[PDB]
Design a protein around this ligand. Structure first.
Ligand SMILES: [Mg+2]
Ligand SMILES: [Mg+2]
Ligand SMILES: [Mg+2]
Ligand SMILES: [Mg+2]
Ligand SMILES: [Mg+2]
Ligand SMILES: [Mg+2]
Ligand SMILES: [Mg+2]
Ligand SMILES: [Mg+2]
Ligand SMILES: [Mg+2]
Ligand SMILES: [Mg+2]
Ligand SMILES: [Mg+2]
Ligand SMILES: [Mg+2]
Ligand SMILES: [Mg+2]
Ligand SMILES: [Mg+2]
Ligand SMILES: [Mg+2]
Ligand SMILES: [Zn+2]
Lengths: 451, 523, 81
RNA sequence: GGUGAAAUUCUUGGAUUUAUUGAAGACUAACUACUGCGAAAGCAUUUGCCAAGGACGUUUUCAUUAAUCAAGAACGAAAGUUAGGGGAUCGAAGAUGAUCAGAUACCGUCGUAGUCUUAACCAUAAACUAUGCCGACUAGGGAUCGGGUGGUGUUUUUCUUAUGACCCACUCGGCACCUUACGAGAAAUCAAAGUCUUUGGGUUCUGGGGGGAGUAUGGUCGCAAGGCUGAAACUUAAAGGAAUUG
RNA sequence: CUCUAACUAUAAAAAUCUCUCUUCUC
């Protein structure tokens, strides 16, 4: 019939008391056969009332059914598809307002506790999933997915649930499989990509480390399979998040390369300050120095080769090659503070432990004069400690323990215990650079590798 | 049905005699239940009205005790009988009614609570109504113990309320059970006939256990064996909850109820699952690591822990299978939320067991010694470690399994502080009834297993390493360290010069290459 | 058609046809051992039971009259034998 | 009004229509079909009661109790006859106004008995499917009605099972249908009108050219109308059936 | 290899008919 009479009858069913009759009536109006023949764009507000009472009610799968029938009634041209996309974005916005209402009820309930929202959250999340599954394989819907993605992303931000991301990601995977299954819109791929960027941004907006990294690896696969290069505006913070992941995740060379890429992306944005460039270069340089050496071909297959599939590279360089490449660069090398460069030249070339530690006592407090030393201490500290180990092995073999205990003792910001010293030496020996014989009858250490 | 229900209520209002009241209720209450028999759960107000006029039935019988069924001169009724015609005796063909009403209410209530959101307030008020259901159970038990006199008939008609007294009591602590009993006895100002004389004293502590054990003792005398197995499983349930673990293990060994349980229905197996996991948890409370290792090696060996234990919603079970016949079957055996034992606690207990049993032994296996480690425990922590070793992510922890695996990797590496820090970070331990002592025992055992795995790991690049310094830096008594070292040397016979007057080793002899060379030189 | 083996019809074809028209006039019915949800006893019932079969143990009528087979009582368990 | 055209007839006491009501008896529209029930006639608003029956289901019961059937019986459309009750409509008779050569016929208006009933006679109809009943077999196809079968079936909706309603593959029975002849017929046609000269399943009742004639007469039933039974004298070479061409 | 929409509106009267019917064989 008429949208206004439909709204009147839904209002009457609000009045008498039965809202499910309002839902069924609005379903009758929207899903009628004549909506196929009549222009769906003209009859918009019946769907709006359907949305209103559906929010009042608890029937989200019938919402999905009504929306899918209203698609099925208009499958030829773009006008009705834009109309249904608008009503779908309105539905997503309205259920997000309902989620805010449930949040304020939960806040009041918390105050009463001091002085089941999960049901409504599950209902609304399943409504989101039904909307997402419904809008698959349809082409001309463009702003529709953008609106749905944005409001769903707000939904994921407001509440903390890790299984919702898994469900959403796998369902998008199946949707892209279906889209491949039924292949004139080149914005769809970029739309999924931007959904992924919002996923990453919110996943790092609140206390997550693996969700964002999984979305990021999917983003890498999407870049490489597709043609277009993502937005530098969002890729800057995207690689900031990617750097946030590489703190303990494993290989630190990937952290160095990604933080280099963040420096590269920050080199052209309107917000450009040169002391920030100095600080970013110092951070990159200290992180690169913190990277642990890897000079020995391993046994069999080290399972740390699948990571380099995140930064477009496959060949395996060493830390020395990476730092030489950093030296070959210009943007970083013209902005690093000179004291860190001095300490670097102390660390690697002519790493005589006595003079290196003395220059550490000279330059470590000054290295903390600017707020950059807190970034990477532990791997750099382990590097200097392993350097003490290797230099002591090179120097002499016949020696007692306590001499090593005091020749390995480090200044305040990089110091450890004696058992820490022994355990670090033990696990550097487990790597099997040079085997050692450690006796304790007179507390002696002897480096024995027959040349 | 609804108009007939209203008509019977009208006739109850018109009726005057108590026997007419009881007959009208006997015609009406099952009509209401049949009007609410197709539904999953009944209207709360209508179900409470059925509860209330069932209690009305019981109270009016209490006003007409043993008189509506005339005395044993003629046990069947004598006066007007031509109209209903359904009067043959007054023993069990008419008396066997009210417990049926109670149990129908209880079945509908259980289906409702499984069909209600556990975290909602309506679930809590339904629990408050379950309190009244148990009080009605007690009132019905009192009335039925009053009615039947012959001990055979009394037993046959009164073991069922013993089962009911079990079914809604066993889980809570003794205090709240005493409170429930006192409240029920207050709700009945007058009636008092019981086999066990509860009203006389409610001031002792060894009373809930005594009452439940008396229920099991009285229950063991009737012919039904499945009910007897049910009662012994409930005894295990209660003992592993409150009493201790030694008694539960001893009566498990006394009852040997293992072979008749799977041939029967699934409820027996469900209760077996719950009591076995409960006793494993209690053994871990009493610091029995290898014991609960042996215990939980039955349910967690298989991948599924949802169906077998029975702790689940319906959406999470409606996707594993897609047919309607089992969607009402795969969910019918579901378990009440006021009964649940945390899956997180079970998983972290089993994972801690795997960490304490395997990692030192797997270190000894990797070192080169093969003398003892024959078996391969199903679904151990080694498979999780290998699967983690198979993937591309090696970063921060995500769940309880990740924290357990990282505690295992710190265990392997040589330290113990990261493992205990993760265990304190593992927040599945907030449900331990005993916190301080079990945490101290776990800390000491983490220390000792780290020291053992360090003994296994480094004996090749070492020729001498300290033992008392290890004890000081690992917080273990030195004598306990040397005793653990002697135990290890008995288990493996490691070639090593071990001393107490010296506290210094002499290890450089040879692990296995020398022995193979010796055997080849032999012949 | 035009050449068969009436001695050896296909068993699928054999049960396909109507009884009283097969090779040997055999009955379609069978006997089910039904247990009430209440009592664990086993009570035998003819598949197309006519009367309202009652378990002698308790008034728990298991199968109701119908044109075809008697309809069970939603709680019992039947075994083919 | 009414018709092909018109007149008779009612109408300023206002006929025709326009509304409300109320009375009577009538029938049960449209649902309504190659669909159902019954032995046939016949049966169509709703509801209750009364009894009955078919078909289906049945590892229920008896064991030839079976088929048709002279004699005997029960029903038996409409019209008709008694009597009593009702009396709308419609209409044999009659009265009319037309058409025509005549029209006391067809068209047109009024109108008696009937039409509807209540008990009793009447027992005939193109009471036709112009195919007697009970059996067995033989060819392809669909639907349809009644029952009962099996679905991992669909929507149903009461969350889900249960029903119901549908979809499929059935099967038993019923009205039927379509295609075909490889069977029949003289053909029209028939799935029986086949299984008939290669002549035999069991059984009743009818006809022997057409007229005379269902007439004469005698019975017999009926008040009456008339029904059942039922010829002959005599008169003729055709009557008749189906199809073909004009 | 996807489907089920249109439709109209006539009647007056006209009866009868004498013959003559004749082969197919090469
Ligand atoms: Mg007038
Ligand atoms: Mg009608
Ligand atoms: Mg019909
Ligand atoms: Mg006769
Ligand atoms: Mg008549
Ligand atoms: Mg005239
Ligand atoms: Mg006349
Ligand atoms: Mg006339
Ligand atoms: Mg007239
Ligand atoms: Mg006749
Ligand atoms: Mg003749
Ligand atoms: Mg004649
Ligand atoms: Mg005569
Ligand atoms: Mg002819
Ligand atoms: Mg003349
Ligand atoms: Zn029973």
């Amino acid at each position: 019939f008429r949208p206004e009479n439909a709204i009147k009858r839904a209002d009457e069913l609000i009045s008498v008391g039965e809202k499910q009759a309002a839902l069924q009536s609005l379903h009758d109006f929207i899903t009628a056969r004549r909506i196929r023949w009549a222009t769906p764009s003209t009859v918009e507000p019946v769907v709006f009332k359907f949305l209103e009472i559906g929010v009042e009610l608890k029937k989200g799968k019938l919402l999905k059914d009504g929306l899918h029938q209203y698609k099925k009634l208009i499958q030829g041209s773009t006008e009705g598809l834009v109309s249904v996309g608008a009503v779908a974005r309105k539905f997503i916005d309205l259920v997000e307002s309902k989620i805010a209402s449930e949040q304020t009820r939960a806040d009041e309930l918390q105050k009463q506790e001091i002085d089941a929202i999960t049901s409504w959250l599950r209902f609304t999340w399943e409504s989101y999933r039904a909307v997402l599954d419904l809008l698959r394989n349809n082409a001309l819907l463009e702003i529709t997915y953008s609106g749905v993605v944005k409001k769903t992303m707000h939904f994921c931000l407001k509440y903390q649930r890790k299984n919702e991301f898994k469900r959403l990601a796998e369902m998008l995977r199946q949707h892209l499989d279906a889209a491949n299954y039924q292949q004139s819109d080149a914005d769809t791929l970029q739309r999924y990509l931007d959904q992924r960027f919002q996923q990453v941004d919110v996943s790092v907006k609140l206390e997550l480390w693996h969700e964002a990294y999984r979305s990021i690896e999917d983003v890498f696969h999407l870049m490489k399979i597709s043609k277009r290069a993502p937005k530098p505006s969002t890729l800057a913070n995207y690689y900031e998040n990617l750097v946030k992941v590489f703190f303990v995740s494993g290989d630190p060379l990937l952290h160095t390369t990604a933080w280099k890429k963040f420096y590269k992306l920050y080199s052209t944005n309107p917000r450009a300050t040169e002391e920030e460039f100095k600080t970013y270069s110092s951070t990159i340089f200290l992180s690169a120095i913190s990277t642990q050496l890897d000079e020995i071909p391993s046994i069999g297959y080290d399972p740390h080769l699948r990571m380099y599939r995140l930064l477009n590279l496959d060949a395996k360089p060493t830390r020395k090659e990476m730092l030489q490449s950093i030296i070959e660069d210009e943007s970083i090398y013209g902005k690093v503070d000179e004291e860190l460069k001095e300490l670097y030249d102390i660390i690697e070339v002519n790493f005589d432990v006595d003079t290196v530690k003395q220059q550490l006592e000279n330059l470590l407090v000054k290295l903390s004069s600017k707020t950059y030393f807190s970034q990477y201490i532990a791997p750099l500290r382990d590097v200097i400690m392993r350097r003490v180990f290797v230099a002591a092995s090179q120097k002499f073999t016949t020696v007692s323990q306590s001499e090593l205990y005091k020749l390995a003792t480090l200044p305040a910001p990089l110091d450890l215990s004696a058992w820490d010293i022994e355990k670090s030496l033990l696990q550097a020996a487990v790597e099997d650079y040079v085997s050692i014989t450690i006796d304790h009858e007179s507390a002696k250490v002897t480096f024995a590798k027959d040349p | 049905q609804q108009s007939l229900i209203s008509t019977l209520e009208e006739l109850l209002t018109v009726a005057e005699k108590p026997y007419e009241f009881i007959m009208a209720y006997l015609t009406l209450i099952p009509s209401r239940f049949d009007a609410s028999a197709n539904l999953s759960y009944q209207p709360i107000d209508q179900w409470k009205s059925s509860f209330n006029d069932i209690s009305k039935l019981l109270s009016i019988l209490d006003q007409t005790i043993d008189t509506y069924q005339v005395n044993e001169f003629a046990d069947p009724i004598d006066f007007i009988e031509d109209e209903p015609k359904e009067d043959s005796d007054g023993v069990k063909r008419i008396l066997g009614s009210i417990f049926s009403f109670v149990e129908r209410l209880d079945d509908e209530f259980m289906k409702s609570l499984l069909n209600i959101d556990p975290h909602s307030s309506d679930y809590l008020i339904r629990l408050r109504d379950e309190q009244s259901i148990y009080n009605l159970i007690l009132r019905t038990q009192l009335y039925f113990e009053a009615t039947l006199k012959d001990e055979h008939d009394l037993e046959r008609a009164l073991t069922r309320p013993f089962v009911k007294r079990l079914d809604h009591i066993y889980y809570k602590s003794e205090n709240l059970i005493k409170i429930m009993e006192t409240a029920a006895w207050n709700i009945i100002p007058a009636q008092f006939k019981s086999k066990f004389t509860s009203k006389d004293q409610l001031d002792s502590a060894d009373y809930v256990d005594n009452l439940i054990d008396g229920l099991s003792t009285i229950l063991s005398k009737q012919n039904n064996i499945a009910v007897q197995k049910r009662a012994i499983l409930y005894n295990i349930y209660y003992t592993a909850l409150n009493k201790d673990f030694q008694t539960a293990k001893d009566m498990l060994l006394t009852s040997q109820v293992q072979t008749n349980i799977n041939q029967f229905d699934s409820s027996l197996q469900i209760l077996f699952n719950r009591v076995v996991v409960q006793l494993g948890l209690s053994a871990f409370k009493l610091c029995l690591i290898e014991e609960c290792h042996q215990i939980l090696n039955d349910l967690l060996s298989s991948s599924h822990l949802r169906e077998i234990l029975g702790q689940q919603s319906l959406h999470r079970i409606s996707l594993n299978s897609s047919n309607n016949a089992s969607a009402d079957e795969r969910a019918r055996q579901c378990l009440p939320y006021h009964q649940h034992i945390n899956l997180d606690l079970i998983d972290v207990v089993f994972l801690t067991c795997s960490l304490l049993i395997e990692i030192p032994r797997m270190t000894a296996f990797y070192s080169g010694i093969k003398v003892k480690r024959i078996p391969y425990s199903p679904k151990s922590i080694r498979r999780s470690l290998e699967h983690y070793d198979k993937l591309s992510f090696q970063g921060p922890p995500e769940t309880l399994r990740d924290y357990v695996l990282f505690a295992a990797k710190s265990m392997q590496k040589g330290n113990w502080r990261d493992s205990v820090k993760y265990l304190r970070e593992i927040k599945s331990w907030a449900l331990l009834p005993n916190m301080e002592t079990v945490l101290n025992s776990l800390t000491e055992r983490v220390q000792v297993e780290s020291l053992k795995t360090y003994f296994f790991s480094f004996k090749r690049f070492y020729s001498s390493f300290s033992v008392a310094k290890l004890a000081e830096l690992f917080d273990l008594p030195e004598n306990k360290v040397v005793e653990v070292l002697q135990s290890v040397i008995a288990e493996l016979e490691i070639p090593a010069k071990l001393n107490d007057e010296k506290t210094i080793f002499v290890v450089e002899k040879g692990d296995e290459i020398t022995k193979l060379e010796e055997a080849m030189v032999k012949l | 058609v035009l050449v068969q083996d009436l001695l050896h019809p296909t068993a699928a074809s054999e049960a396909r046809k109507h009884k009283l028209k097969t090779l040997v006039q055999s009955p379609r019915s069978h006997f089910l051992d039904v247990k009430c949800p209440g009592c664990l006893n086993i009570t035998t019932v003819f598949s197309h039971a006519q009367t309202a079969v009652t378990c002698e143990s308790c008034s728990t009528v298991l199968c109701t009259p119908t044109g075809g087979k008697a309809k069970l009582s939603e709680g019992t368990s039947f075994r083919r034998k």
